[PDB]
Design a protein around this nucleic acid. Structure first.
Ligand SMILES: [Zn+2]
Ligand SMILES: [Zn+2]
Ligand SMILES: [Zn+2]
Lengths: 45, 49, 263, 113, 137, 47, 66
RNA sequence: CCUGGUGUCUUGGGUG
């Protein structure tokens, strides 16, 4: 559903909010949202 | 608000009556208030912040 | 009646003497070359991935400053004047960049030479990032360490320096006249003796000193203007001087047109 | 947030004329020319050229505020000449001098090539 | 009177330009044995007294994603609180400060000492020198 | 109106090629929150 | 943070001369002479290279967050 | 299919 990233081992996985907030690989309890699907534009000024 | 509307202009602390004088608006780009330089003295204003 | 005598010349700077013109014309030529000679420059950066330590618009900001070959830019249209739907081949150049570091050690330096032209108004020689030699990696953009990737798509557009300084073809323009101050346009500051305390112009030997008796010629005008036009490589030095004159002509021509049409 | 678009210095709005001539009826034979979307670059060039003509009695310009790319020029000529015509003459002279100047640079450039 | 003229071309090439970062923190609060706030994208049909801004930048987890530009009063963290005694909840969401804009840079998701969910959203923008900004030797 | 809050690209004018989001669509004149500078512009629907 | 692409004051490109400057310092040249060899004659351009502080080498040491 | 509410009391650090 929503892509996340493990703050320790960088494994990527998803969670459908009701799951506990941890990394499946190492059990780290600090995680980060992956970037949006949308394209980002900047004017280079 | 449009050109030549009168507005009351004021800098604290208002120590005497020329701390509040009426000026005519001129709408301009950029985000500062502009004063003709000869009115800095009665307001005891300067442009250091 | 205007005369030119080129003192030195090379690819990216021309030093020259300009004479038998008015001061105002020499100055307007100086301003036009800095401000109104068109060039090509990146103006839109589509970041599909940036996991480097630099912020997205920080990298994008550096991209805008990379000088691009702008030789054939006169046949190219401004984006704001093109009849097409979104961009196309007639009003933009598309560039692409992709770098990555594999290995757990060392640093991958991303250089301007990795900018790959993908499309463009063929077969016009425009859009390649300028290089000094062939083994010159060019301008440092970013640095990458293990697993960090940078994959961007850049849109380059025609523009002028009035809008943003990245479109300027010049750098400095050295400019001086009357090295011995015969016209008395300046009044020198001194402690003891004005002549000993002020250094000589680098063109002091190109004109003759005022004679010790000589009276002041109140009719003399400025008449010889020495200037050096350095460029960034986005345009060759001879092109900048030529197109400066050309651009200034159309502007005066446009004024002349409007008077004969307003009646 | 209140910075104007930088492209507004040279792009003319559709309802705004590049050039506007009005009379100054207070004195004979005097016009006010308002130039839109232009600079000292153009203005100083025209001004000096005009001042060396014998039939121009007054020429001046001012850029009223640097945050707005316009300027206004005042031009008065003696009774014989019409100011607007004199302006055309000043324009054509400078176009010619720059054409000559461009030619002489090209010639000198090939010799150093 | 102590102002100064700055070269606009120098600003264009990057002089005195700076990054600016702001972080917003929020967490779920406990009101009873099984009465907890909940991070979600609140549906207009089930939640009363919604904010006036747009909710369309939130993902399904109740959190906005990095890379999306935000402007003032946009909701970036959706959270509801139930109303005691359907159509039972009340909005408790956090909008971006009205005077600001920029790009969402990074979103931290974790739990606090009490075990409830805990988020931080850092926003970055770039401040370019302009008329009125202050400088000193 | 069915196009509010949907992503948009501009195909004519000085802002041609830029991404944005429809902030307000009262009638004929849209309000696009441009991505590229921190400004929301008034723009006609033909664009 | 990283070497600027252009000199702020005059615009001459200096972002391609940073690597060349560090190498010249290993060979024992003095700072003034190294700048001279690179043809950075105006002192506006010289400040850019002489006074830049390369912090990006420090930021890269922080083990990537993906 | 119009209306449309988000806190306080302090303390501390700052600006002229
Ligand atoms: Zn893990
Ligand atoms: Zn086109
Ligand atoms: Zn310099």
């Amino acid at each position: 559903g929503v892509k996340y990233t493990c703050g320790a081992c960088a494994h990527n996985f998803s969670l459908n909010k009701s799951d506990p907030v941890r990394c499946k690989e190492c059990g780290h309890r600090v995680i980060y949202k992956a970037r949006t699907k949308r394209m980002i534009q900047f004017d280079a000024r | 608000l449009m050109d030549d509307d009168p507005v009351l202009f004021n800098r604290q602390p208002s120590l005497h009556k020329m701390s509040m004088m009426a000026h005519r608006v001129k709408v301009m780009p950029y985000s500062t208030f502009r004063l003709n330089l000869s009115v800095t003295s009665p307001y005891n204003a300067d442009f250091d912040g | 009646e205007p005369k030119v005598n080129i003192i030195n010349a090379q690819d990216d700077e021309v030093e020259l003497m300009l004479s038998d013109v008015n001061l105002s014309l020499a100055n307007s030529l100086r301003r036009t070359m800095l401000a109104e000679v068109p060039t090509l420059a990146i103006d839109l950066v589509e970041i599909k991935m940036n996991t480097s330590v630099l912020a997205d618009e920080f990298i994008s900001h550096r991209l805008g400053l990379i000088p691009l070959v702008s030789e054939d830019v006169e046949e190219m249209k401004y984006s704001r004047d093109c009849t097409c739907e979104d961009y196309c081949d007639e009003c933009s150049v598309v560039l692409e960049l992709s770098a990555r570091h594999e290995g757990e050690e060392g640093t991958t330096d991303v250089y301007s030479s990795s900018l790959i032209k993908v499309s463009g108004p063929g077969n016009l020689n425009v859009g390649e990032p300028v290089r000094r030699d062939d083994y010159d990696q060019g301008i440092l953009l970013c640095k990458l360490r293990n697993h960090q990737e940078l994959n961007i798509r850049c849109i380059a557009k025609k523009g002028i320096a009035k809008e943003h300084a990245k479109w300027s073809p010049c750098s400095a323009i050295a400019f001086e006249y009357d090295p011995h101050n015969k016209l008395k346009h300046t009044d020198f500051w001194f402690e003891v003796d004005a002549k000993k305390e002020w250094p000589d112009s680098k063109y002091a030997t190109w004109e003759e000193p005022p004679k010790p008796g000589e009276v002041f010629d109140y009719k003399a005008k400025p008449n010889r203007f020495y200037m050096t036009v350095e460029t960034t490589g986005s345009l060759k030095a001879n092109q900048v001087f030529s197109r400066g004159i050309k651009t200034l002509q159309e502007k005066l021509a446009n004024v002349l047109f409007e008077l004969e049409n307003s009646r | 947030m209140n910075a104007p678009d930088r492209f507004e210095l040279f792009i003319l709005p559709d309802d705004v004329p590049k050039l506007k001539i009005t009379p100054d009826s207070r004195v004979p034979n005097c016009i006010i020319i308002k130039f839109e979307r232009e600079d000292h670059t153009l203005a100083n060039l025209l001004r000096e050229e005009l001042a060396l003509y014998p039939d121009v009695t007054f020429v001046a310009y001012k850029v009223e505020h640097p945050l707005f790319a316009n300027f206004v020029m005042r031009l008065q000529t003696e009774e014989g000449t019409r100011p607007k015509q004199a302006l055309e003459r000043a324009c054509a002279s400078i176009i010619n001098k720059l054409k000559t100047l461009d030619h002489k640079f090209n010639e000198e450039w090939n010799i150093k090539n | 009177e102590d102002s100064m003229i700055m070269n606009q071309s120098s600003i264009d090439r990057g002089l005195f330009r700076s990054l600016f970062f702001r972080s917003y923190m929020d967490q779920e609060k406990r009101f009873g044995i099984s009465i907890v706030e909940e991070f979600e994208k609140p549906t207009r049909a089930t939640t009363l007294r919604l904010k006036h801004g747009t909710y369309e930048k939130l993902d399904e987890d109740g959190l906005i994603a990095p890379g999306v530009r935000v402007s003032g009063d946009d909701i970036i963290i959706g959270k509801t609180t139930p109303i005691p005694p359907y159509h039972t909840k009340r909005d408790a969401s956090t909008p971006l400060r009205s005077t600001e804009n920029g790009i969402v840079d990074q979103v931290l998701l974790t739990t606090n000492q009490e075990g409830l969910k805990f988020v931080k959203v850092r926003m970055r923008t770039t401040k370019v020198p302009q008329i009125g900004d202050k400088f000193a030797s | 109106d069915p196009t509010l809050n949907k992503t948009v690209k501009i195909r004519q004018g000085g802002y041609k090629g830029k991404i944005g989001i429809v902030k307000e669509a009262n009638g004929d004149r849209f309000r696009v929150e441009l991505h590229n500078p921190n400004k929301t512009i008034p723009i006609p629907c033909s664009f | 943070m990283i070497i600027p692409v252009r000199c702020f004051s005059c615009g001459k490109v200096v972002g391609d001369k940073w690597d060349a400057y560090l190498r010249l310092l290993e060979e024992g040249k003095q700072e003034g002479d190294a700048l001279d060899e690179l043809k950075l004659k105006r002192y506006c351009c010289r400040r850019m290279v002489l006074t830049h502080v390369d912090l990006i080498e420090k930021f890269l040491r922080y083990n990537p967050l993906e």
